[PDB]
């Protein structure tokens, strides 16, 4: 379809943990999600939450239609469970890399499915548990996922990071090693 | 209010 | 594997030279089975699960009437509402040059994606020993791109990396000296 830009409400329920979600996303970035659990609207950035709003329940509605479409779905497919999709995993740092400056290390997992995921962060083997934060369970077109996670960090010559990831699609959980090079 | 983004209301499947 | 149900729906707004066109879909794990496109003007089955939705909504006028108006209703208003705030983010490039034999021009934290970088060594353009990353999202709502040439070093060589960029009054450059 041609687009000078496309303006999506994704939204999904499942049986596992997240077992709903409901985000509004603009050119492919998220722009606000509904919280489901606070039943309040969550803006990206300071720049929408000042200027606009959404009524949360409106999110809230549709996920009810979502829940009960997909108790109708599971007896109209036979209980079909859809095949694993593994994750691709890449790893690579926001800014150019600088010895002793602070940067930001991007983790993007992608092309999975279903939206089930463990995500964490090594240095030296060992999980980095502060200055983390991550993305949404976010739409593809081809209803795979994808996800980010974000580590700040200090760049250095000998610290070796991973990114390790979890899905049922593995044979073992998945480590993408990242190194200042 | 702010600026009010619309909805879309999904459709109920027939079961 | 566990036991595991998934339903997606979406609602896409697609924007193209003042016109809005809307999709609908609705997705059991990753099989659209049936969708609603403004182009076609009701509910399409996409696979054999959808039969009887599509019809059973295709029977409901007032659906079809809600949903035919999308495009002007909804649409339409939450795109205005996106040209007073989202398409005006002008986030501008950091542009920086380091060598790897290629020279990288790292351009970082800009948005929106559009952009135009090009090498240049003593003043003529150098497109033919390009190779660039695709544009890299972030997911932060900023963007990077990677563009490196390949490049045989000789003293007196100016080599400058321009960027452009709508956020930007003049094009940047950085420039590296061989
Ligand atoms: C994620 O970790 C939890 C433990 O916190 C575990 O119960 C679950 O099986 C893991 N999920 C996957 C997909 O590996
Ligand atoms: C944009 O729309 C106008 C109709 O008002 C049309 O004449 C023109 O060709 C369109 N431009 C493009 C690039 O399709
Ligand atoms: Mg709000
Ligand atoms: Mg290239």
């Given at each position: 379809?041609?687009?000078?830009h496309?303006?999506?409400?994704?939204?999904?329920?499942?049986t596992?943990?997240?077992?709903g979600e409901?985000?509004?996303?603009?050119?492919?970035?998220?722009?606000?999600?509904?919280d489901?659990?606070?039943?309040?609207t969550?803006?990206?950035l300071?720049?929408?939450?000042?200027?606009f709003?959404?009524?949360?329940?409106?999110?809230?509605?549709?996920?009810?239609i979502?829940?009960?479409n997909?108790?109708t779905?599971?007896?109209?497919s036979n209980?079909?469970?859809?095949?694993?999709?593994?994750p691709?995993?890449?790893?690579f740092?926001?800014?150019?890399?600088?010895?002793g400056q602070?940067?930001?290390?991007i983790?993007?997992?992608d092309?999975?499915?279903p939206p089930?995921?463990?995500?964490?962060?090594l240095?030296?083997?060992?999980?980095?548990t502060?200055?983390?934060?991550?993305?949404?369970?976010?739409?593809?077109?081809?209803?795979?996922?994808?996800?980010?996670?974000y580590?700040?960090?200090?760049?250095?010559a000998?610290?070796?990071?991973?990114?390790?990831?979890?899905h049922?699609?593995?044979?073992?959980?998945?480590?993408?090693?990242?190194?200042?090079? | 209010?702010?600026?009010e983004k619309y909805?879309?209301?999904?459709?109920?499947e027939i079961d | 594997?566990?036991?595991?149900?998934?339903?997606q729906?979406?609602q896409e707004c697609?924007?193209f030279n003042?016109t809005?066109?809307?999709?609908?879909?609705?997705?059991y794990?990753?099989?659209?089975?049936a969708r609603?496109?403004s182009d076609?003007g009701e509910?399409?089955?996409?696979?054999?699960?959808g039969?009887?939705a599509?019809?059973?909504?295709n029977?409901?006028?007032?659906?079809?009437?809600?949903?035919r108006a999308?495009?002007?209703r909804?649409?339409?208003?939450?795109?205005?509402?996106?040209?007073?705030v989202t398409?005006?983010?002008?986030?501008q490039?950091?542009?920086?040059?380091s060598?790897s034999?290629?020279?990288?021009?790292?351009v970082?934290?800009?948005?929106?994606g559009?952009?135009?970088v090009?090498?240049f060594?003593?003043?003529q353009?150098?497109?033919?020993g390009?190779?660039?990353?695709?544009?890299?999202?972030n997911?932060?709502?900023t963007?990077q791109?990677?563009?490196?040439?390949?490049?045989?070093p000789?003293?007196?060589?100016?080599?400058?990396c321009?960027?452009?960029?709508?956020?930007?009054?003049?094009?940047?450059?950085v420039?590296?000296?061989?």
């Open positions: 379809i041609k687009a000078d496309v303006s999506t409400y994704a939204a999904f329920v499942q596992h943990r997240p077992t409901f985000m509004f996303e603009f050119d492919e970035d998220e722009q606000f999600y509904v489901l659990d606070k039943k309040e969550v803006w990206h300071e720049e929408f939450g000042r200027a709003s959404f009524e949360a329940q409106g999110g809230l509605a549709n996920i009810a979502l829940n009960n997909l108790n779905l599971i007896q109209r209980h079909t469970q859809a095949a694993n999709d593994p691709e995993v890449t790893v740092p926001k800014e150019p890399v600088e010895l602070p940067n930001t290390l983790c993007h997992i092309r999975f499915f089930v995921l463990n995500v964490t962060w240095c030296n083997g060992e999980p980095v502060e200055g983390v934060a991550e993305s949404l369970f976010l739409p593809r077109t081809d209803y795979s996922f994808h996800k980010f996670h580590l700040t960090f200090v760049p250095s000998e610290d070796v990071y991973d990114c390790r990831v979890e049922w699609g593995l044979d073992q959980p998945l480590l993408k090693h990242w190194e200042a090079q | 209010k702010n600026l909805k879309g209301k999904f459709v109920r | 594997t566990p036991e595991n149900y998934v339903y729906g979406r697609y924007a003042g809005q066109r809307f999709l609908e879909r609705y997705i794990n990753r099989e659209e089975y609603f496109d076609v509910f399409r089955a996409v696979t054999e699960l039969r009887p599509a019809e059973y909504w029977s409901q006028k007032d659906i079809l009437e809600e949903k999308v495009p002007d909804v649409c339409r208003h939450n795109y205005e509402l996106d040209e007073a398409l005006q983010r002008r986030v490039p950091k542009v920086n040059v060598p034999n290629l020279l990288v021009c790292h970082t934290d800009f948005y929106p559009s952009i135009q090009r090498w060594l003593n003043g353009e150098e497109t033919a390009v190779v660039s990353t695709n544009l890299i999202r997911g932060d709502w963007f791109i990677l563009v490196m040439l390949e490049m045989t000789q003293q007196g060589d100016v080599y400058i321009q960027v452009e960029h709508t956020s930007l009054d003049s094009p940047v450059t420039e590296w000296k061989a």
